[PDB]
Design a binder for this molecule. Structure first.
Ligand SMILES: CCCCCCCCCCCCC/C=C/[C@@H](O)[C@H](CO[C@@H]1O[C@H](COS(=O)(=O)O)[C@H](O)[C@H](OS(=O)(=O)O)[C@H]1O)NC(=O)CCCCCCCCCCC
Ligand SMILES: CCCCCCCCCCCCC/C=C/[C@@H](O)[C@H](CO[C@@H]1O[C@H](COS(=O)(=O)O)[C@H](O)[C@H](OS(=O)(=O)O)[C@H]1O)NC(=O)CCCCCCCCCCC
Lengths: 206, 206
């Protein structure tokens, strides 16, 4: 988050793949900021999506210059297999990870907390799950997630972690997150919109 | 499993890194044979270890010809950071994955089953966990694992999956697993032994 930020969207509202991936590839360290091995495989899972995208991009950076480029090339290339293939499926899942991240931090900067347990971040994690991922998952993965929330940190530890290196007050640092959240939220919206427009979203549970 | 098998160990009992990685890189598809998204991030997690190993090997295949080569080069290179770095830490975790796999299939070929639920494989998965991974994990990851067992298949489905492509009777196919299990078990033993000998094992919980 914080330091290497995604720049804002333009007229055409196209997101360049190169810059996008350079950007998002900083976000899995962050799972280290949850501060537990419980969360290792999740990060792996997102490195995964990203790699799969970078794989396609690199086969021909011009041909796949923008994120739409990918979706539209793959639609042609693969049959009715699409969108359930390729980078389109990777970005499809990744955008949901980014969105979770997005809702989560939003929730934390906004001061949504549980009155009882106010330095836990389970409420902030659950709201995230519910907006970003729940509908695509069966009960088991939800049970798991709830159980993972016990390995989540207290809020204040989480933020030291996010800011680790920088020597700012917690208050100062939340402020850095809000600014991050501006073009992050913007960008996720643009991808979500695209997926709806190109008709690449899958609405059913894995 | 089955088709691309690791060849047996020699006099020196050294395991060549190239052949080893070519071998093991077939094993994550297998998690697809559990037949659920619950298990996706695990496979990612093992692709991970493997990648990290292949990364080092490729920087100089001769210098890291054998698996011991790696452990011993890294010991010198890194400080008292070692063995908690590098490929040594990757192979350290990977060998535990391979061992889980190893105990699991053993257990299934041997006909260890729960008398009540005899076509479930939870008992076979739990024995595995307990021998291979439990001691290195805290209660949460165990809860999770138990909960993942509900997304595990019935035994007979699992085996169709493992053999998918081949058109053999279940009985015939278990027989293919037993033979696989010969040099697989042998090889994991040789790595476990090495790690003890070079003093690279970490016995405490992540
Ligand atoms: C012994 C140790 C433990 C034992 C086993 C327990 C393992 C449980 C693991 C946790 C629960 C699973 C959660 C993840 C489920 C994933 O299946 C989903 C969907 O992931 C996609 O699956 C897809 C399946 O494909 S399809 O069938 O063709 O549609 C794809 O293969 C896709 O791969 S790709 O090639 O496109 O690149 C892949 O990302 N993963 C996610 O939902 C990612 C969510 C991001 C995590 C957000 C952060 C969570 C933080 C939690 C805080 C409490
Ligand atoms: C919303 C979706 C879900 C939300 C979040 C829930 C996520 C729960 C995920 C399942 C539970 C976690 C199980 C895995 C825990 C891992 O931490 C452990 C240890 O993994 C190692 O961690 C290490 C931590 O490093 S250390 O702190 O410096 O020591 C390393 O980073 C290492 O990376 S490497 O660079 O060396 O390559 C890494 O493999 N993973 C394992 O134990 C792997 C086990 C293999 C799985 C075997 C198959 C299970 C099948 C289950 C069937 C029921």
């Amino acid at each position: 988050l914080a330091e290497h930020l995604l720049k804002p969207l333009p007229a055409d509202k196209q997101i360049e793949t190169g810059p996008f991936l350079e950007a998002v590839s900083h976000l899995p360290p962050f799972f280290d900021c949850l501060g537990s091995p419980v969360f290792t495989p999740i990060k792996a899972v997102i490195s995964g999506n990203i790699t799969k995208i970078k794989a396609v991009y690199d086969t021909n950076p011009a041909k796949f210059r923008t994120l739409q480029n990918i979706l539209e090339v793959e639609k042609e290339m693969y049959g009715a297999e699409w969108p359930k293939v390729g980078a389109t499926l990777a970005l499809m899942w990744l955008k949901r990870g980014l969105r979770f991240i997005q809702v989560f931090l939003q929730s934390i900067c906004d001061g949504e907390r549980d009155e009882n347990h106010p330095n836990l971040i389970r409420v902030n994690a659950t709201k995230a799950y519910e907006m970003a991922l729940k509908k695509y998952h069966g009960w088991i993965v939800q049970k798991i997630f709830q159980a993972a929330l016990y390995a989540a940190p207290y809020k204040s530890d989480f933020l030291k972690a996010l800011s680790k290196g920088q020597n700012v007050t917690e208050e100062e640092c939340l402020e850095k997150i809000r600014l991050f959240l501006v073009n992050y939220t913007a960008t996720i919206d643009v991808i979500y919109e695209m997926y709806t427009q190109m008709n690449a979203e899958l609405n059913y549970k894995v």
